[PDB]
Amino acid sequence: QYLRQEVLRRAEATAASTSRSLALMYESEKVGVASSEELARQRGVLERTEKMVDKMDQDLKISQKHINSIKS
Amino acid sequence: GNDRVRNLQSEVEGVKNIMTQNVERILARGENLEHLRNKTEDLEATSEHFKTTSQKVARKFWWKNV
Amino acid sequence: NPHLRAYHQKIDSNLDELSMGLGRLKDIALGMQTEIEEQDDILDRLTTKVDKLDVNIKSTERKVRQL
Amino acid sequence: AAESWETLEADLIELSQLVTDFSLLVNSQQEKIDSIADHVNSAAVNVEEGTKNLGKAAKYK
C-alpha cells in the first residue's frame, strides 16, 4: 500500500495550492480597500481647493471695489 | 474539481482586466494632476505679483497724503 | 479514507471562500474605476477654475499698475 | 492535476501584483495632490493681502 501515499501527496498538494491562492485573494482585498480609501480622501483635497479658488474670486471683486474708490 | 478551477481562473482574469484598466486610468489622472500643479505654480506667482503691486500702491498713497 | 477526506474538505473550503472573495475583488475594482471617472470630472473643473483665476488676477493687477 | 491549480495561483499572484502597482501609483500622486493644494493655498494669502493692501491704499488717500 505504498501506491496510497502517492495519492495523498496529490491531494495535499492541491490543498496547499488553494490555501496560498485564498491568502493571495485576501491580501489583494486588504490592499485594494486601502487605496480606494486613499483615492477617496484625495478627492476631498481637490474639493477644498475648489473652495479656495472660489474664495479668491470674491477677494478679486472686493479688490475691484477698492480700485473704484481710489479712482474717485 | 476541474470545472471549479477554470471557473475561478476566468473570474481572476476578469478582475485582472479591470485592474489593468484602472492602472491605465490612474496614469492618466497622474498626467492631468501634473498639468494642474504647473498651472497652480503659475497661479501662485501671478498672485504674488498682485500682492507686491498693491503694497507699492498702499505706501505711495501713504506718502502722497501724509 | 480519513486523510483524503480531510484534504478534500480543506480544498472545498478554500475554493468556496476563494470564489466569494473574487466577487468581492471585482466590486472593489469597479469601485476604483468609478472614483477615477468622477475625479476626472472634478479635475477638468478645477483646471478651468484655476485658469479663469489666473487671468482675473492679472486683469486686476493691470488696474493696480496704472494708479 | 495540480498544474491547473498552479496556474490559478499564478493569476492570483499577477492580480495581487496589479493591485500593488495601482496603490503605488495612487500613493505617488499624493505628492501632486498636495502641491496643487499648497500653491492654491499660497495664492490665496496673496489675494487676501492684495485686497487688504488695496484697502489700506484706498483709505490712506
From Swiss-Prot, chain B:
Its main location: membrane. Keywords: Acetylation, Antiviral defense, Autophagy, Cell membrane, Coiled coil, Cytoplasmic vesicle, Endosome, Lipoprotein, Lysosome, Membrane, Phosphoprotein, Protein transport, Transmembrane, Transmembrane helix, Transport. Residues 4-64 form the v-SNARE coiled-coil homology domain. Changing K64R: Does not affect stearoylation in response to S.flexneri infection. It is found in: Lysosome membrane; Early endosome membrane; Late endosome membrane; Cell membrane. Residues 1-66 are cytoplasmic. A lipid is attached at K56, K60 ((Microbial infection) N6-stearoyl lysine). One of its GO terms (molecular function) is SNAP receptor activity. Belongs to the synaptobrevin family. SNAREs, soluble N-ethylmaleimide-sensitive factor-attachment protein receptors, are essential proteins for fusion of cellular membranes. SNAREs localized on opposing membranes assemble to form a trans-SNARE complex, an extended, parallel four alpha-helical bundle that drives membrane fusion. VAMP8 is a SNARE involved in autophagy through the direct control of autophagosome membrane fusion with the lysososome membrane via its interaction with the STX17-SNAP29 binary t-SNARE complex. Also required for dense-granule secretion in platelets. This is Vesicle-associated membrane protein 8. It comes from Homo sapiens. The chain holds residues 9 to 74 of 100 of the full protein.
UniProtKB/Swiss-Prot annotation, chain C:
Residues 5-67 form the t-SNARE coiled-coil homology domain. It is found in: Cytoplasm; Golgi apparatus membrane; Cytoplasmic vesicle, Autophagosome membrane; Cell projection, Cilium membrane. Found in brain, heart, kidney, liver, lung, placenta, skeletal muscle, spleen and pancreas. SNAREs, soluble N-ethylmaleimide-sensitive factor-attachment protein receptors, are essential proteins for fusion of cellular membranes. SNAREs localized on opposing membranes assemble to form a trans-SNARE complex, an extended, parallel four alpha-helical bundle that drives membrane fusion. SNAP29 is a SNARE involved in autophagy through the direct control of autophagosome membrane fusion with the lysososome membrane. Also plays a role in ciliogenesis by regulating membrane fusions. Belongs to the SNAP-25 family. Forms a SNARE complex, composed of VAMP8, SNAP29 and STX17, involved in fusion of autophagosome with lysosome. Interacts with multiple syntaxins including STX6. Interacts with EIPR1. Interacts with STX17; this interaction is increased in the absence of TMEM39A. (Microbial infection) Interacts with Hantaan hantavirus nucleoprotein; this interaction prevents the breakdown of the viral glycoprotein N by virus-triggered autophagy. It is linked to Cerebral dysgenesis, neuropathy, ichthyosis, and palmoplantar keratoderma syndrome: A neurocutaneous syndrome characterized by cerebral dysgenesis, neuropathy, ichthyosis and palmoplantar keratoderma. This is Synaptosomal-associated protein 29. The lineage of its organism: Eukaryota, Metazoa, Chordata, Craniata, Vertebrata.
UniProtKB/Swiss-Prot annotation, chain D:
Keywords: Acetylation, Autophagy, Coiled coil, Cytoplasm, Cytoplasmic vesicle, Endoplasmic reticulum, ER-Golgi transport, Host-virus interaction, Lysosome, Membrane, Mitochondrion, Phosphoprotein, Transmembrane, Transmembrane helix, Transport. GO terms for molecular function: protein kinase binding; protein phosphatase binding; SNAP receptor activity; SNARE binding. GO terms for biological process: autophagosome maturation; autophagosome membrane docking; autophagosome-lysosome fusion; endoplasmic reticulum to Golgi vesicle-mediated transport; endoplasmic reticulum-Golgi intermediate compartment organization; exocytosis; Golgi organization; intracellular protein transport. Dephosphorylation by PTPN2; regulates exit from the endoplasmic reticulum. (Microbial infection) Cleaved by the L.pneumophila serine protease Lpg1137, impairing endoplasmic reticulum-mitochondria communication, leading to inhibit autophagy. It comes from the Eukaryota. One of its GO terms (cellular component) is endoplasmic reticulum-Golgi intermediate compartment. Residues 1-57 form the t-SNARE coiled-coil homology domain. SNAREs, soluble N-ethylmaleimide-sensitive factor-attachment protein receptors, are essential proteins for fusion of cellular membranes. SNAREs localized on opposing membranes assemble to form a trans-SNARE complex, an extended, parallel four alpha-helical bundle that drives membrane fusion. STX17 is a SNARE of the autophagosome involved in autophagy through the direct control of autophagosome membrane fusion with the lysosome membrane. This is Syntaxin-17. The gene is STX17.
